[PDB]
Every structure is written in C-alpha cells, then in structure tokens.
Design a protein around this ligand. Structure first.
Ligand code: FMN
Ligand code: SF4
Ligand code: SF4
Ligand code: SF4
Ligand code: FES
Ligand code: K
Lengths: 432, 263, 214, 87, 45
C-alpha cells in the first residue's frame, strides 16, 4: 500500500520507452514500443472515460505548475459554446536545464501526439495548434515528418484513428522567448502578436487563440497521458508520493559527473539520484554546496538540507523549493553561489516581455544591485533591500515570470545569507 | 434583478454582473490608483497600481481586470494593498528621469500626484538609470520617451479611437521602447488628444511647451467652432492671454477629445 | 543590433528589393492554411521566420512588404520582428554562432569555449568576423541545457562541447564542410558517460491494461 | 485621471478687461470680483447664496460620467470587432 | 533495428534542409479539414 522506495526508476516505469531515441522515433518504432495501440478505442470509450482515468490518476503539472491534470481538463469538457475547441502544446522549454520537451519530440514524437489525440477526445479538440520553440528547428522537422506518417495512416486527421474526429494537429515554430513558455503568453504568440502573457481572468477554458477554448498541457503531461489511459490511474498513482505521482524527466546537470536527461521516479533521494544515474556529484557531497533540484523557478537548498530530500512537490515545498521541471543542476564548492545564479538572474532579465511594471523594472534593478553584490560593492543592509523588493514583485506581476524569477533569488538570500555577507567586506578590504 | 451584491471595505454596494473593481468602488466615491486604465479606452491592467488586496484572498487582484462576484468586500485600505501600491509605484519611479522642473506635466502630472498620496518619501535606488532616444512624430507634440512609463495608453488610443497604427512598443526586456521604429508622424485628426492621454510628460504639446505652468492657469469653459460639433473645451488662460485649449467632458457629443485644429 | 529605432540605411531601406520564390509563395499559402480565415494575423510569425531565409536577415523592406501581403498593419509585424530574439534586423554572417552561457552552461565552464572562439576569430562578442562568416554572441540557453556547454549555428546545433573541440567546430566550418550536429561526447542521444542507467530491457509492445473495453 | 476636484460647486464669475500696464507687463485689472470662487456642497444652496446678495445666476447640471461597462475578455474575440491587437 | 541502447537513430536530423519546416508545410495540404468560418475576412473586417 506504500512504495517507500520511490527512487531508481525502472524501465517499464519510463512512459517514453524510446526516451533515448533507441528503437525508432518515427512510426516504425512507435508501434514497436506500443504507440497507436487501441488509441481509437480510447477515443471510442468516451471523453468521460479518460476523464475518469486522469482523475483517478491526477497528473500534477510537470511544467512547473503542479496543478492536477484531471480537474484542469475537466474544466473544459462541456458542450461546445460554438467556438472551436482546440488543444495547445507548450514545448518552449526555456527553463535553464529543462529538456523534457525535447526528449519527447526527437525520440518519440508520436508519444506527444498520442497524448494530444487521446486528450483531444476528452477536450473536444477538433484541432491542435501545438507549438515548438524557435531554437528547436531541427526537432520541429522531426515531428513534422512523424506527423505525416500519422496523417496519411488515418491515425490523425480525417476521422482520426478511424473514428469520427476531424482532429488535425498543427505545429508552429517559435522565434525565441522564455516568457513564451507560459500558457497566457504562448496563446497570443500563436495568435500572431508579441508574445506577452495575458491578463486574468479570462481563461483558456472560454477564450484562447482567436478567442477559442484551448487546453495548454506540458508535453510531459501530454505524452504520459497515454500510459494512464492504456493502464489506468493505478499505474500512475502507485509511483510517486501523494498527489505527486507518475514519472518525469529529471535533467541532472551542473556539476555532475555524467550530466544527462533520465526519466526518473519522484520522491527520490538526491544522493542516489546523482549516484546511480550519473556516478555522483563532482567532488562528492562535500564539494556539493547546494542544488537547484526543480529548475529555475525552484530555489536552491544547502548541503545541510539536500541529503535525501524527496522530489515530491510536497517535500520541495517543505524544502522551500519546487519540482519545477526536475531540471536538477549542481554547483560545487569551487563554484561561487553568488556567481552561480549571477547568470541565472540576468537570464531572467534577458527573458521578460516587460509588459507589467514589477517584472520590467524588477529583474534589471535586481541585476544591477546584485552585480555590486557578487563584486561586493554594497553594505550589509543592501541584502535586506534585495529581500524587500524580491517579495515586492512576488505576487504583483501579471504572469509567473516575475514570481518565477523571484524564487531563485528569494531562496538564495534565506539560505546562504552569511556567504552573501562574506563577499562584501572582501571587496571592502582591497577596494578600500 | 440579476445584479449581484458585494461590499467595499464595509458598506454594501450593488454592482452589475461582470463589474470590475475600478467600476465597483467608484460608486461610493473611490478612485483606485491607476496608471494604465482609461474610462472610455480599452482595459490594459499593465501599470499594476490598481492592485488591492481583500481579506480571505492570499494574493492581490488586478482591480481593473477582476470580474467581481458575490461576497467580495474589497479591502481598499488594507496594508497589503497599501504595500502593493507603494512598491509598484516606486518601481515606476525607479527608471524615471529627474525632469520634473523641466517637464511640462509638473503640477498636472498623474505620476507626481499619486506619488504624493500613495507614495514613499525616499528612494532605495542606488544604481544607474535608463535612457531612451527621443523621437519626433510631428511639429505639434513633443516626445520625451525617457519619461515614458510604458502604460501603452498611446498605442491603444491610436489603434482603437484614432484608427491608425503609427504607435507601438518595440523591444524585449526593461528597454521596451514605445514609438514608431521607422520615423513617422502622427497624422490623426484626433492626434492631439494623445497629449491628454499620456499620464506623464512623455507626450506634450509643442506649441505650449514651456509657456506656462498648470497652477497659474484660470480655466474657463467654451466650445469648439472649427467644427459644427461645438466640442466642449476648457480654455486655459494666464495674466490676460490664452495658452491652451483643453477638451471638456460631455460624453455623448465630444466625450473628452477635441480635434487637432481646435487644440 | 541593440537598437529599437530604425535608421534608414542606404542598403536596408524600404526600396530594398525583396521577394519570394515561386515555391516560397506556396510556403506562405501552406503557412496561412493552418490558421483559420479571418485570423490570418497569426501567420505573421512563421512568415517572418521564412523572411530571413531568403535575404539572410530581416530587412525593413521585408517587414512592411510582409505587412501588405498579410493585410496586417505595418506596426504589428514591426513588433513581431523586434521582440523575438533570433529575428535580427541587422545583416548577420552566414554562420550565426549562438554560444550558450546560461547558468547551467556557465557552471560547467562555458567561458572556456567563448574565450577559445574569441581568440581564433579575433573579433569580440556580437560583431561579425572580418570575412563576416561567423558571428559570436552570448545569448540565453538553447533549451537543451544539460550536456557540456553548447553552441548553435543558424539552424544547426552542437552540445557536449569542450574548449578543445570548439576549435574543431569552426575549422571545417571555415573550410566549408558541415561538422557533426549534436553532442560531441559519447552521448548519442543523452546517455551518461557511464553508459546508460535505464531502458536495459527491450520496450514492450501492445496489449496492456485493456480496462474493460479500453 | 484623478477626480477629486469635481465633487463640489463653485461661484465663478465672468472675465473683465485684462490690460497690459505701461511697465514691465503687469496685467492690471479693475474688477475686484475675479479670484473669489466659492466651494459649495450642492446646487440649491448655491442659488440660495446667489439671490441673498442679489447676484444673477447661471447654473449648470453636473456632468456625471455615463456607465463604463468594459470587459477584458472582449479584447480577445472571434468575430467581434472589439478584438484588440495592441496592449 | 533492436532496442540497441547505444544508438541515436536520428540521422534524419542531419539530413534536414534550410527550408525544411515550410517544405513539410507545403506538402501537408491534402489531409486538411476546413478552417472555421470566422465570418469577417480579417479581424479588422
Ligand atoms: C516563465 C514560464 C515558462 C514556462 N515554460 C514552459 C515550457 O517551456 N513548457 C511547458 O510545458 N510549460 C511551461 N510553463 C508552464 C505553462 O505556463 C503552463 O502552466 C503549463 O504548460 C500547463 O500545462 P501542465 O499543467 O501540463 O504543465 C512555463 C511557465 C512559465 C511561468
Ligand atoms: S512578469 Fe510581467 S513583465 Fe515580466 S514577463 Fe511576465 S507579464 Fe511580462
Ligand atoms: S512626467 Fe511627471 S514625474 Fe516625470 S518629469 Fe514630468 S512632472 Fe516629473
Ligand atoms: S508614451 Fe505616454 S501614453 Fe505612450 S506608453 Fe509611454 S506614458 Fe503611456
Ligand atoms: S489600472 Fe489596474 S493595472 Fe493599470
Ligand atoms: K501627457
């Protein structure tokens, strides 16, 4: 009744059985690994059938959201108001270290289109304007040739899979924006405007691209939805902790011996996460000063805390962080944590639509004040001011980019504050 | 009938379905601090000064884009909303150039008045500031783009009311320059009103530029005669001569806008 | 670059000749057929992406020309070009080098490759090479930010890159031939240097779960 | 955009001659009732002030703003012109 | 052909032209359903 050993994910547990592009990404290997088996029957059973399956599963939002997918999809399953219901796929992957979007498209692009097709039956989506980031031209091509195999086989398109459904999936390349990764910004990025986040509340439920209902689902959540419709909610919920369940691409990188992207169980201890799948962290745990386990929007946590924290959303919350996209990266002792996120915080500034005042004036101001921080040209109070304006922009920005930029700097302050106070008088003694 | 009941910091107020907080608290005589919303201009919700926190709501809500429902007793004077107004303002204030003695909006500036009521008393900004290249879109309006607050009030007024698209916001990041990219000129017959729309000294009247200050003008009311509409105007005079023709409020005839000829 | 106000250049002007191939008009028709009629303003994004394949960059003659064919106001496409990063309004070299220095890459010393490429090419960050072949500039991460620090050439990427073989990336690029696009190290797809810690057993096929009627 | 000046009534007079003085340019005036605007709560007391001292009145009804029904979702439409492409 | 956990099997990525996206877009015109009738010819219309 409880699988306390929620680490060392097994091969069957990997939803994307061709995650490393082993057998074949295209249609030829898709049927080999189990794609397109009774997809029509999943559609034929009923939109509420898969609604129950996702509800009994409860897929947490793997794209740094955490919202269970069962309710998000069920907000939309209703008789159409008249506006064509559409499906939207967010494959921007602008998050530092996140690669889950890419490891699905270039190694089993059908797995993504399985989730769009099986999901679209629940959603009522007669079309899907699936999006791909502009930096992935190579990979939009791979799913374009893959989309052709499914289009001409009857599996997608005219009466998709042989059951009445004019479901057609349309791919749109991006042109480069981390802010475009948000649903409310990608929605008008598809609409043909500056990719700015949309104010709320309207919702994807009622409006969207050209004012149409549009289910934005992260590719990992999209492409895992097959396995939860082919096996059931028992398969998904059995792995992972309460709420946080299933399998996610843990992107181990940073200061790790063998940086790679592996499907991994959540609620996994950090130590065997880097030991078994990567041979350890460079210099061991002692060299390991901190870890960013979830991703950019997930604050880093100190060596005295890492040990065996479980990457289940609840356990990151008590760890003052989040699951993000499991884009876990590590900094060693040789790496200055003030310098470590120095590129991270300026990366957030370089990626901001700038519409709302807290983000437009926030990160750049944060960039300048921290530039004198990593150099040390500041007074001990300045860290407290950095605390104050970081919370000031928190919850005051239209979208979650500001809040997504708030968590990294916010976590650093309350976790390595003495080190922040360490570097400044080091500046003072020599630049006196 | 179908109208739903909400409160505003106590007193119960009756509201229309779909009512936003701005048009909810004005019934009792409140102006929520705003910098990107205009009454007869489409919603923006970008300035984030309308922010107000209510009890039993963990996160502050954008007032101008918040459809109120039953049992929403807007805590206008809540400290968190007061904190939200302060921080958002000082964030606008940060990259604003210190041109108040040399900006014509001095004395009639929305940024100045709000910063005196819902404003701090000193700055925490210890870094360098931001500067923007000035543009020139006609010998009738002066564009000091460094003083812009990116409220996008200009681009909306042009695209929806003026029916032209010579205005836009270019860039990505803090920069977010608002202008024309390629040099152009505001040819709208109603281009003059964009001076009234801009809350800051970013857009100012070229003929009036540095001729008078607001606190000395003895405003008087008259009408347009160039057009047969008889647009209601406010004539700003000083020491026995006419400085500027400002548009009055009359709604169904001229709203708050006047022709470029009569301005 | 680093500008958001247009200066009319002698070569990049509204009069600059700019058109489409007979198959290119088909590509635009293929672009607009995906989005619904009466909402063709959505097509402005990929056509602008298409725009710089012809000339090599985004000429201002293209922005207003593509506005008139897509019946959109000029300023709307003006904003689409200036916002997105790869939409470059200034002429760029044939090899648009996209070096990655975002925190995960900088942690694994993405500075070494940048200095190595800076030394051979001589030209600094941003500016073009003296033959205008390569263009080195620091930008955000490619979106694949796990392997050793990565670079991206126009539409051809490389990851798992070391300061030794960045020397081996531009050498044949200078010669003309295309290097191997992908992870330089033993990561064929993403596999760790210690082999592969998953997917050992062959993947299963169909016939699983079949809840009731499935 | 502030409104907190439209809430009261006044007792403004009409303008008289504003002539330039021979010296530096003072606009010398001979009417004492120039800068004597009042402040009133309503309009019935306004007129009540008018005839007690025997001044002819010229009243004007307050231009209360018309209702401002707006919808953010309206900016994003399907076949409605209110579809806004500028923010 | 087998699982061959030491393979990439994405040589087609190397064999992609500069016009690839639009080229597949051009040939993706047959199995298309009718884009919804928004009415007005343009959002401005
Ligand atoms: C700055 C930012 C970037 C994001 N980038 C991505 C992304 O690259 N891919 C993604 O799937 N979701 C991304 N998201 C999350 C989406 O906004 C959205 O919450 C999610 O796609 C919804 O689907 P899910 O619940 O399955 O995650 C991003 C969010 C933010 C705030
Ligand atoms: S936080 Fe605000 S300003 Fe920053 S990208 Fe998001 S919506 Fe734009
Ligand atoms: S716009 Fe307002 S705050 Fe800015 S310089 Fe002018 S008067 Fe001062
Ligand atoms: S120029 Fe004026 S109206 Fe336009 S965005 Fe700036 S402050 Fe607003
Ligand atoms: S008025 Fe509410 S944000 Fe500008
Ligand atoms: K103004």
């Amino acid at each position: 009744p409880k699988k306390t050993s929620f680490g060392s994910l097994k091969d069957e547990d990997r939803i994307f059985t061709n995650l490393y592009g082993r057998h074949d990404w295209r249609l030829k290997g898709a049927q080999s690994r189990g794609d397109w088996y009774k997809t029509k029957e999943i559609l034929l059973k009923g939109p509420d059938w898969i609604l129950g399956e996702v509800k009994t599963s409860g897929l947490r939002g793997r794209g740094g959201a955490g919202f269970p997918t069962g309710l998000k999809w069920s907000f939309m399953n209703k008789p159409s108001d008249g506006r064509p219901k559409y499906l939207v796929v967010n494959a921007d992957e602008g998050e530092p270290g996140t690669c889950k979007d890419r490891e699905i498209i270039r190694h089993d692009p059908h797995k993504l289109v399985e989730g769009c097709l099986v999901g679209g039956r629940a959603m009522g989506a007669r079309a899907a304007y699936i999006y791909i980031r502009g930096e992935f031209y190579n990979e939009a091509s791979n799913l374009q040739v893959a989309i052709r195999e499914a289009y001409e086989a009857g599996l997608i398109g005219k009466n998709a899979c042989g059951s009445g459904y004019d479901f057609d999936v349309f791919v749109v390349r991006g042109a480069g924006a981390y802010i475009c990764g948000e649903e409310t910004a990608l929605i008008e990025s598809i609409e043909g405007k500056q990719g700015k986040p949309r104010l709320k509340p309207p919702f994807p439920a009622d409006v969207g691209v050209f004012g149409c209902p549009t289910t934005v689902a992260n590719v990992e959540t999209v492409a895992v939805s097959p396995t939860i419709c082919r096996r059931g909610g028992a398969w998904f919920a059995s792995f992972g902790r309460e709420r946080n369940s299933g399998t996610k691409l843990f992107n181990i990188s940073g200061h790790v011996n063998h940086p790679c992207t592996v499907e991994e169980e959540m609620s996994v201890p950090l130590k065997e996460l880097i030991e078994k799948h990567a041979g350890g962290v460079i210099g061991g745990w002692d060299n390991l000063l901190a870890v960013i386990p979830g991703g950019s929007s997930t604050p880093l946590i100190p060596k005295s805390v890492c040990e065996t924290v479980l990457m289940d959303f609840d356990a990151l919350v008590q760890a003052q962080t989040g699951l993000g996209t499991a884009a876990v990266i590590v900094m060693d002792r040789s790496t200055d944590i003030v310098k470590a996120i120095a590129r991270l915080i300026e990366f957030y500034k370089h990626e901001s639509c700038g519409q709302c005042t807290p983000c437009r004036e926030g990160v750049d101001w944060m960039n300048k004040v921290m530039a004198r921080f990593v150099k040390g040209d500041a007074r001990p109070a300045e860290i407290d001011s950095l605390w104050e304006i970081s919370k000031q922009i928190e919850g005051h920005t239209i979208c979650a980019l500001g809040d997504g930029a708030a968590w990294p700097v916010q976590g650093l302050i309350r976790h390595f504050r003495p080190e922040l106070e360490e570097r400044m008088q080091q500046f003072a003694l020599q630049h006196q | 009938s179908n109208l739903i009941e909400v409160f505003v910091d106590g007193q119960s107020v009756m509201v229309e379905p779909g009512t936003t907080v701005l048009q909810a608290c004005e019934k009792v005589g409140m102006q929520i601090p705003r910098f990107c919303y205009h009454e007869r201009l489409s919603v923006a919700g970008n300035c984030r000064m309308c922010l107000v926190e209510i009890e039993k709501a963990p996160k502050v809500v954008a007032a101008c884009a918040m459809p109120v429902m039953k049992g929403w007793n807007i805590l206008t004077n809540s400290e968190k909303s007061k904190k939200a107004r302060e921080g958002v303002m000082e964030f606008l204030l940060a990259n604003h150039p210190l041109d108040c003695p040399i900006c014509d909006q001095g004395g009639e500036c929305d940024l100045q008045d709000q910063s005196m009521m819902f404003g701090s008393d000193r700055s925490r900004f210890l870094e360098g500031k931001r500067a923007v290249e000035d543009k020139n879109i006609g010998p009738l309006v002066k564009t000091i783009m460094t003083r812009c607050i990116q409220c996008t009030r200009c681009i909306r007024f042009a695209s929806e009311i003026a029916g032209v698209d010579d205005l836009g916001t270019t860039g990505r990041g803090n920069d977010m320059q608002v202008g024309t990219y390629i040099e152009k000129m505001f040819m709208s017959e109603l281009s003059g009103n964009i001076i009234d729309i801009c809350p800051v000294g970013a857009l100012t009247s070229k003929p009036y530029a540095f001729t008078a200050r607001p606190w000395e003008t003895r405003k008087t009311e008259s009408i347009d005669v160039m057009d047969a509409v008889g647009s209601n105007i406010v004539v700003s005079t000083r020491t026995g001569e006419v400085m500027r023709i400002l548009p009055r409020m009359h709604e169904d005839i001229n709203e708050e806008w006047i022709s470029d000829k009569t301005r | 670059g680093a500008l958001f106000v247009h200066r009319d250049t002698p070569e990049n002007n509204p009069d600059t000749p700019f058109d489409f191939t007979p198959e290119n008009y088909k590509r635009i028709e293929a672009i607009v057929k995906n989005y619904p009629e009466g909402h063709k303003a959505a097509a402005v994004l990929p056509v602008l992406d298409l725009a710089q394949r012809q000339n090599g960059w985004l000429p201002i003659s293209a922005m207003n020309k593509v506005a008139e064919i897509l019946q959109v106001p000029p300023m709307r496409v003006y904003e689409v070009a200036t916002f997105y990063t790869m939409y470059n309004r200034k002429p760029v070299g044939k090899y648009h080098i996209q070096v990655c220095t975002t925190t995960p890459c900088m942690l694994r010393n993405s500075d070494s490759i940048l200095e190595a490429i800076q030394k051979k090419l001589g030209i600094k960050v941003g500016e073009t090479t003296p033959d205008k072949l390569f263009t080195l500039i620091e930008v955000e991460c490619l979106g694949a930010c796990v392997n050793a620090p990565m670079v991206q050439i126009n539409d051809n990427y490389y990851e798992d890159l070391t300061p030794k073989d960045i020397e081996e990336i531009i050498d044949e690029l200078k010669a003309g031939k295309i290097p191997k696009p992908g992870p330089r190290s033993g990561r064929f797809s993403c596999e760790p240097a210690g082999g592969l810690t998953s997917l050992t057993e062959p993947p299963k096929g169909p016939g699983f779960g079949v809840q009731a009627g499935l | 955009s502030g409104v907190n000046n439209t809430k009261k009534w006044k007792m403004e007079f009409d303008t008289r001659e504003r002539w330039e003085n021979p010296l530096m340019g003072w606009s010398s005036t001979a009417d004492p009732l120039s800068n004597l605007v009042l402040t009133f709560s309503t309009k019935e007391d306004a007129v009540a002030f008018a005839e007690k001292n025997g001044w002819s009145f010229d009243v004007e009804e307050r231009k209360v703003p018309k209702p401002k029904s707006k919808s953010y979702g309206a900016n994003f439409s399907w076949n409605k012109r209110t579809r806004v492409s500028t923010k | 052909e087998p699982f061959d956990n030491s393979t990439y099997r994405n040589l087609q990525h190397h064999e992609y032209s500069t016009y690839t996206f639009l080229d597949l877009n051009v040939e993706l015109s047959k199995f298309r359903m009718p884009q919804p009738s928004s009415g007005r010819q343009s959002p401005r219309h």
